[PDB]
Amino acid sequence: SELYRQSLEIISRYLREQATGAKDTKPMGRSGATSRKALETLRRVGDGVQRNHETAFQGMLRKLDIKNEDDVKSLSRVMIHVFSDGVTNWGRIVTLISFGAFVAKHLKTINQESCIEPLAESITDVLVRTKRDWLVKQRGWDGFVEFFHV
Ligand SMILES: Cc1ccnc(-n2ccnc2)c1-c1cccc2c(CCCOc3cccc4ccccc34)c(C(=O)O)n(CC(=O)N3CCNCC3)c12
Ligand SMILES: [Zn+2]
Ligand SMILES: [Zn+2]
Protein backbone atom coordinates (compact mmCIF):
# COMPACT_ATOMS: atom_id res chain seq x y z
CA SER A 1 0.00 0.00 0.00
CA GLU A 2 0.96 3.60 -0.06
CA LEU A 3 0.94 3.52 3.80
CA TYR A 4 3.72 0.92 3.83
CA ARG A 5 5.74 2.59 1.09
CA GLN A 6 5.31 6.08 2.58
CA SER A 7 6.29 4.79 6.03
CA LEU A 8 9.37 3.03 4.66
CA GLU A 9 10.53 6.19 2.86
CA ILE A 10 10.14 8.40 5.95
CA ILE A 11 11.75 5.91 8.36
CA SER A 12 14.59 4.96 5.99
CA ARG A 13 15.38 8.60 5.25
CA TYR A 14 15.39 9.44 8.97
CA LEU A 15 17.70 6.53 9.89
CA ARG A 16 20.12 7.29 7.05
CA GLU A 17 20.32 11.00 7.84
CA GLN A 18 20.80 10.28 11.54
CA ALA A 19 23.53 7.75 10.81
CA THR A 20 25.41 9.76 8.18
CA GLY A 21 24.52 13.37 9.05
CA ALA A 22 23.72 13.95 5.34
CA LYS A 23 20.36 15.26 4.07
CA ASP A 24 18.71 13.59 1.05
CA THR A 25 17.61 16.10 -1.64
CA LYS A 26 15.75 13.66 -3.91
CA PRO A 27 12.02 14.50 -3.76
CA MET A 28 9.79 12.44 -1.48
CA GLY A 29 7.29 12.02 -4.31
CA ARG A 30 3.58 11.50 -3.68
CA SER A 31 2.78 12.88 -0.20
CA GLY A 32 5.66 15.35 -0.55
CA ALA A 33 4.73 18.12 1.89
CA THR A 34 3.38 15.59 4.40
CA SER A 35 6.33 13.18 4.11
CA ARG A 36 8.76 16.11 4.39
CA LYS A 37 6.87 17.40 7.44
CA ALA A 38 6.85 13.90 8.98
CA LEU A 39 10.62 13.67 8.54
CA GLU A 40 11.09 17.14 10.06
CA THR A 41 8.83 16.06 12.95
CA LEU A 42 11.06 13.01 13.53
CA ARG A 43 14.14 15.27 13.48
CA ARG A 44 12.77 17.54 16.19
CA VAL A 45 10.74 15.16 18.38
CA GLY A 46 13.19 12.29 17.90
CA ASP A 47 16.13 14.44 18.98
CA GLY A 48 14.19 15.22 22.15
CA VAL A 49 13.49 11.54 22.78
CA GLN A 50 17.12 10.49 22.21
CA ARG A 51 18.33 13.25 24.52
CA ASN A 52 15.72 12.92 27.28
CA HIS A 53 15.87 9.13 27.32
CA GLU A 54 19.61 8.83 26.62
CA THR A 55 20.26 6.76 29.74
CA ALA A 56 17.75 4.07 28.67
CA PHE A 57 18.88 4.26 25.02
CA GLN A 58 22.57 3.81 25.93
CA GLY A 59 21.64 0.92 28.25
CA MET A 60 19.49 -0.79 25.63
CA LEU A 61 22.19 -0.46 22.98
CA ARG A 62 24.67 -2.09 25.39
CA LYS A 63 22.18 -4.95 25.99
CA LEU A 64 21.76 -5.62 22.27
CA ASP A 65 25.58 -5.82 22.02
CA ILE A 66 25.64 -5.39 18.25
CA LYS A 67 28.87 -6.61 16.62
CA ASN A 68 27.70 -7.93 13.22
CA GLU A 69 24.74 -8.52 10.85
CA ASP A 70 23.73 -11.62 12.87
CA ASP A 71 23.18 -9.46 15.97
CA VAL A 72 21.05 -7.09 13.86
CA LYS A 73 18.82 -10.04 12.95
CA SER A 74 18.49 -10.96 16.65
CA LEU A 75 17.32 -7.48 17.72
CA SER A 76 14.23 -7.82 15.46
CA ARG A 77 12.84 -10.37 17.94
CA VAL A 78 13.34 -7.90 20.79
CA MET A 79 11.90 -5.01 18.75
CA ILE A 80 8.67 -6.82 17.85
CA HIS A 81 8.24 -7.98 21.46
CA VAL A 82 8.80 -4.65 23.23
CA PHE A 83 6.79 -2.65 20.70
CA SER A 84 3.84 -5.08 20.59
CA ASP A 85 3.50 -5.13 24.38
CA GLY A 86 0.88 -2.70 25.70
CA VAL A 87 -1.06 0.15 24.11
CA THR A 88 0.36 1.99 21.10
CA ASN A 89 0.38 5.72 20.52
CA TRP A 90 2.51 8.27 18.62
CA GLY A 91 4.89 8.62 21.59
CA ARG A 92 5.76 4.94 21.46
CA ILE A 93 6.05 5.06 17.67
CA VAL A 94 8.55 7.92 18.01
CA THR A 95 10.45 5.85 20.61
CA LEU A 96 10.55 2.94 18.14
CA ILE A 97 11.83 5.06 15.28
CA SER A 98 14.17 7.29 17.38
CA PHE A 99 15.77 4.23 18.91
CA GLY A 100 16.14 2.88 15.36
CA ALA A 101 18.10 6.05 14.54
CA PHE A 102 20.20 5.58 17.70
CA VAL A 103 21.00 2.02 16.59
CA ALA A 104 21.70 3.25 13.03
CA LYS A 105 24.25 5.74 14.41
CA HIS A 106 25.91 2.85 16.23
CA LEU A 107 26.02 0.81 13.01
CA LYS A 108 27.81 3.74 11.32
CA THR A 109 30.25 3.93 14.23
CA ILE A 110 31.17 0.22 14.01
CA ASN A 111 31.39 0.34 10.18
CA GLN A 112 28.45 -2.03 9.58
CA GLU A 113 26.37 0.64 7.75
CA SER A 114 24.92 -1.84 5.25
CA CYS A 115 22.63 -3.06 8.04
CA ILE A 116 20.86 0.32 8.27
CA GLU A 117 18.55 -0.33 5.32
CA PRO A 118 17.40 -3.74 6.56
CA LEU A 119 16.91 -2.25 10.03
CA ALA A 120 14.61 0.44 8.59
CA GLU A 121 12.69 -2.29 6.74
CA SER A 122 12.33 -4.28 9.98
CA ILE A 123 11.02 -1.24 11.88
CA THR A 124 8.59 -0.42 9.07
CA ASP A 125 7.43 -4.08 8.94
CA VAL A 126 6.66 -4.09 12.68
CA LEU A 127 5.00 -0.66 12.69
CA VAL A 128 2.83 -0.96 9.59
CA ARG A 129 1.97 -4.66 9.59
CA THR A 130 1.16 -4.92 13.31
CA LYS A 131 -0.45 -1.50 14.01
CA ARG A 132 -2.18 -0.87 10.66
CA ASP A 133 -5.61 -0.48 12.27
CA TRP A 134 -4.42 2.09 14.84
CA LEU A 135 -2.42 4.02 12.21
CA VAL A 136 -5.37 4.19 9.82
CA LYS A 137 -7.78 5.21 12.60
CA GLN A 138 -5.37 7.95 13.72
CA ARG A 139 -5.05 9.31 10.15
CA GLY A 140 -1.57 7.93 9.37
CA TRP A 141 1.27 10.35 8.71
CA ASP A 142 -1.14 13.33 8.39
CA GLY A 143 -2.25 12.50 11.94
CA PHE A 144 1.35 12.14 13.11
CA VAL A 145 2.28 15.54 11.69
CA GLU A 146 -0.82 17.21 13.20
CA PHE A 147 -0.33 15.55 16.60
CA PHE A 148 3.13 17.12 17.09
CA HIS A 149 2.59 20.24 14.87
CA VAL A 150 6.31 21.17 14.82
C1 LIG B 1 13.32 -1.88 26.68
C2 LIG B 1 13.38 -0.64 27.54
C3 LIG B 1 13.54 -0.82 28.90
C4 LIG B 1 13.60 0.29 29.73
N1 LIG B 1 13.51 1.50 29.20
C5 LIG B 1 13.36 1.75 27.86
N2 LIG B 1 13.26 3.07 27.58
C6 LIG B 1 13.32 3.64 26.37
C7 LIG B 1 13.12 4.99 26.59
N3 LIG B 1 12.94 5.16 27.92
C8 LIG B 1 13.02 3.97 28.54
C9 LIG B 1 13.26 0.64 27.01
C10 LIG B 1 13.13 0.82 25.53
C11 LIG B 1 14.35 0.90 24.86
C12 LIG B 1 14.43 1.06 23.47
C13 LIG B 1 13.28 1.15 22.72
C14 LIG B 1 12.06 1.07 23.38
C15 LIG B 1 10.70 1.13 22.84
C16 LIG B 1 10.27 1.28 21.41
C17 LIG B 1 9.89 -0.10 20.84
C18 LIG B 1 11.01 -1.13 20.89
O1 LIG B 1 12.06 -0.75 20.01
C19 LIG B 1 13.18 -1.52 19.84
C20 LIG B 1 13.50 -2.56 20.71
C21 LIG B 1 14.64 -3.32 20.47
C22 LIG B 1 15.45 -3.05 19.38
C23 LIG B 1 15.12 -2.00 18.51
C24 LIG B 1 15.92 -1.71 17.42
C25 LIG B 1 15.60 -0.67 16.55
C26 LIG B 1 14.46 0.09 16.79
C27 LIG B 1 13.64 -0.20 17.88
C28 LIG B 1 13.98 -1.24 18.75
C29 LIG B 1 9.88 0.98 24.05
C30 LIG B 1 8.40 1.04 23.95
O2 LIG B 1 7.78 0.57 22.99
O3 LIG B 1 7.82 1.66 24.87
N4 LIG B 1 10.67 0.87 25.14
C31 LIG B 1 10.15 0.66 26.47
C32 LIG B 1 10.02 1.90 27.30
O4 LIG B 1 10.23 2.99 26.80
N5 LIG B 1 9.66 1.70 28.58
C33 LIG B 1 10.01 2.72 29.58
C34 LIG B 1 9.27 2.49 30.88
N6 LIG B 1 9.33 1.11 31.31
C35 LIG B 1 9.55 0.07 30.33
C36 LIG B 1 8.92 0.51 29.02
C37 LIG B 1 11.96 0.91 24.76
ZN1 LIG C 1 12.54 6.82 28.96
ZN1 LIG D 1 11.56 5.08 33.06
Residue numbers in the entry: 172 to 321
What's in the article?
Using this construct, we embarked on an extensive co-crystallization screening campaign spanning structurally diverse ligands and broad matrix crystallization screens. Notably, we did not obtain crystals for apo MCL1 173–321, consistent with the apparent difficulty in obtaining a ligand-independent crystal form for MCL1. As the co-crystallization of MCL1 and ligand 1 would not be generally applicable to other ligands, we explored a protein engineering approach to develop a more robust MCL1 crystal system. As an initial proof of concept, we re-investigated the co-crystallization of ligand 1, which in earlier efforts relied entirely on zinc-mediated interactions between ligand and neighboring protein. The structure of MBP-MCL1 was determined to 2.35 Å and has high overall similarity to the structure of MCL1 173–321 (superposition r.m.s.d. of MBP-MCL1 and MCL1 173–321 bound to 1: 0.58 Å overall, calculated on all common Cα). Interestingly, in the absence of the zinc and pyrophosphate packing interactions, the pyridine ring rotates 180° from the previous non-MBP structure, with the 4-methyl group now pointing toward H224 and the imidazole group facing out towards solvent. In our own hands, removal of ligand- and zinc-mediated crystal packing revealed a new sidechain orientation where the imidazole and methyl substituents were opposite to the non-MBP structure.
Specifically, cell death-inducing mitochondrial permeabilization is prevented by tight sequestration of membrane-localized proteins by anti-apoptotic members of the BCL-2 family, which include BCL-2, BCL-XL, BCL-W, A1, and MCL1. Consistent with its frequent amplification, MCL1 is highly expressed in many tumor types, and high expression levels of MCL1 contribute to tumor development and resistance to chemotherapy. There has been intensive effort to target anti-apoptotic members of the BCL-2 family with small molecules designed to release pro-apoptotic proteins from their sequestered state. In this report, we describe the development of a general and robust crystallography platform for soluble MCL1, using a combination of protein fusion and engineering strategies.
